[PDB]
Amino acid sequence: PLKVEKFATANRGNGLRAVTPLRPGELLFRSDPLAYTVCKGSRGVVCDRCLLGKEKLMRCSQCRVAKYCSAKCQKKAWPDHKRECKCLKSCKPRYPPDSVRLLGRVVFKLMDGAPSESEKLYSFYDLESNINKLTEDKKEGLRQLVMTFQHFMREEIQDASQLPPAFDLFEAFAKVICNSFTICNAEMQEVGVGLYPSISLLNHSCDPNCSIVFNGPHLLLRAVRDIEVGEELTICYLDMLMTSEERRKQLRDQYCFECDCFRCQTQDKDADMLTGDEQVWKEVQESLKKIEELKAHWKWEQVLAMCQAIISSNSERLPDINIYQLKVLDCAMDACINLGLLEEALFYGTRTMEPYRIFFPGSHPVRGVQVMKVGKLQLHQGMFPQAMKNLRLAFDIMRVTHGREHSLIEDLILLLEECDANIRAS
Ligand SMILES: O=C(NC1CCN(S(=O)(=O)C[C@H]2CC[C@H](NCCCC(F)(F)F)CC2)CC1)c1cc(C2CC2)on1
Ligand SMILES: Nc1ncnc2c1ncn2[C@@H]1O[C@H](CSCC[C@H](N)C(=O)O)[C@@H](O)[C@H]1O
Ligand SMILES: [Mg+2]
Ligand SMILES: [Mg+2]
Ligand SMILES: [Zn+2]
Ligand SMILES: [Zn+2]
Ligand SMILES: [Zn+2]
């Protein structure tokens, strides 16, 4: 018995609404992807199948592009990799855009696979394309993706009889652009891109009543507020650390809509997000383009070097509540954790705690993860009362956003028991 149902909204296309009253933390839907792939930066760093990082990965011998954590993952991935393998090998050394590799997997799944549970409420065929809202520049970009797909897939798909009935590649890429999900690992690093057509029914809010979280490729949809019968379910499509102007640009560019929510009408939190000297944070925002690229490719030493030059600059500095400063602290923290620089990681992480309380109101999985990271760093440094407070706060958030079905909650329970045993021996 589903707790959610598809419906036709008055002015947002189709949507999802509650069939029963919902409480924070309630699991509403869970889904594997219709199709997914590792993303550009994480290719060869994480396993193609389970999206977990490993010090050494085994490569597919035929294409040498797909890489796996284990013989189990390589073999289990073979049915969904078999046809793309010949295309990837034929295209070497050229690697396709993520969207092109993704749509290849969509096509093979729809041609060769049984009907997917991911499409229970809504299918790839049903997805919004927004084609009549596309500007000419966007249509041109989609045409180039179509031609890139035809080149990449030529070994496996030569004509329309090898595509699903009435399949239009331009329309398919339009759907991919507006309906791709960024798959994040347990630490909230972007590691993949996938299509989850039933989850695509969720419309956007900058102050949503639901949240999604990834456990490998698996997606969990949970309520994060009380929700009444008939009430529309929403998620936030975007990073919370964005001004209303930034959200406006991305929602127009990628999703072809103008957001009418209260936060956008009132520029909610914009002024607090942009405190400090504008010339300074404009420079930091510029530097973050490279920092974000380095982080996406797991280049932690390079990330840390650039972040330290900002955090410890000889020149003017920013308040930690400035969102570009905050992003630099976040990246520096994550780099230090991955490099084993645990004292420095804790310094940066502790500084983010109050800004995160302000910018992630309610129960948000990203703040849950951040607080867990800080609590774990404090546990390792022997600060048991401080660690316990943060681990308990992380649990209060993550019991709602992640839940028992997410493996990170089991990890958190072990940290809480270890911290508690230390306190009791003191
Ligand atoms: O992919 C979808 N949403 C995303 C929203 C964002 N999250 S997140 O949980 O906040 C994790 C993010 C936290 C920030 C992190 N970036 C930090 C970079 C900072 C810099 F630049 F300084 F380096 C990246 C991960 C993931 C899911 C989606 C699609 C749809 C379709 C339209 C239906 O809905 N939702
Ligand atoms: N808050 C919002 N206001 C207006 N349109 C929205 C919206 N959130 C999502 N959408 C629409 O939904 C698309 C994302 S997919 C969400 C389901 C979609 N409404 C459908 O009918 O299939 C966006 O590109 C936009 O067309
Ligand atoms: Mg349509
Ligand atoms: Mg329309
Ligand atoms: Zn694996
Ligand atoms: Zn291969
Ligand atoms: Zn809004």
Swiss-Prot record:
One Gene Ontology cellular component term attached to this UniProt record is: nucleus
Activity control, as annotated, is: Histone methyltransferase activity strongly stimulated by HSPCA.
Per its UniProt record, what Gene3D superfamilies does this chain match? 1.10.220.160, 1.25.40.970, 6.10.140.2220, SET domain, Tetratricopeptide repeat domain
Domain SET per the UniProt entry, residue ranges: 2-238
Top EC class of this enzyme: transferase
Q: What CDD domains does this protein map onto? A: SET_SMYD3
Listed binding positions for Zn(2+) 1 are 47, 50, 69, 73
Query: Where is the region C-terminal domain?
Result: 270-426
Q: What EC number(s) would the UniProt record show?
A: 2.1.1.354
**Gene Ontology BP terms:** cellular response to dexamethasone stimulus; establishment of protein localization; methylation; myotube cell development; nucleosome assembly; positive regulation of transcription by RNA polymerase II
Pfam family membership, one: zf-MYND
Instruction: Write out the annotated subcellular location.
Output: Cytoplasm; Nucleus
Assembly mode: Interacts with HSPCA. Interacts with HELZ. Interacts with POLR2A; the interaction may be indirect and may be mediated by HELZ. Interacts with HSP90AA1; this interaction enhances SMYD3 histone-lysine N-methyltransferase.
Q: What does this protein do?
A: Histone methyltransferase. Specifically methylates 'Lys-4' of histone H3, inducing di- and tri-methylation, but not monomethylation. Also methylates 'Lys-5' of histone H4. Plays an important role in transcriptional activation as a member of an RNA polymerase complex. Binds DNA containing 5'-CCCTCC-3' or 5'-GAGGGG-3' sequences.
Protein name per its UniProtKB record: Histone-lysine N-methyltransferase SMYD3
Q: What is the organism field in this record?
A: Homo sapiens (Human)
